[PDB]
A and B are shown apart, each in its own frame.
Chain A
Amino acid sequence: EAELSAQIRYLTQVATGQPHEGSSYSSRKDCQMALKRVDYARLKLSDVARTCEQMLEN
């Protein structure tokens, strides 16, 4: 009973609402469109290599 009373008294006077402030996921996703831009550059250079391919045979 004393443990229960101490548990509720330690948690008594902090009763209010809590805002999850800030957008950490918005800043976290800010690497991902740069990464897909890097992937766009990757497919661009892959197409550069594929255009380099056919002049080798002929």
Chain B
Amino acid sequence: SEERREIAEVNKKLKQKNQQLKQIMDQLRNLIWDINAMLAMRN
């Protein structure tokens, strides 16, 4: 019965964790778009 409350509460926590890592990997995407232009005109 109350396990459904646990499911409902942890579904949005894992979604929030997915979004929290989503902003982090977006920052890493910005970093890798910075770094691919470095070797592009290194010479």
| A40 to chain B: closest residue by CB | B34
Please, which residues of chain A bring their CB within 8 A of the CB of B34?
A: 37
Looking at chain A's contact residues, the main secondary structure is helix
Contact with A along B14-27 (1 / 0, CB 8 A): 00000010011001
Q: How far is the CB of B32 from chain A (nearest CB, A)?
A: 10
A interface, CB within 8 angstroms of B: 34, 37, 41, 44, 48, 51, 55
Please, which residues of chain B bring their CB within 8 A of the CB of A34?
A: 38
Residue from B20, B23, B27, B38 having most chain A Cβ neighbours under 10 A: B27
Q: How far is the CA of A41 from the CA of B32 in the complex (A)?
A: 10
| A48 to chain B: closest residue by CB | B24
Please, which residues of chain B bring their CB within 8 A of the CB of A37?
A: 34, 38
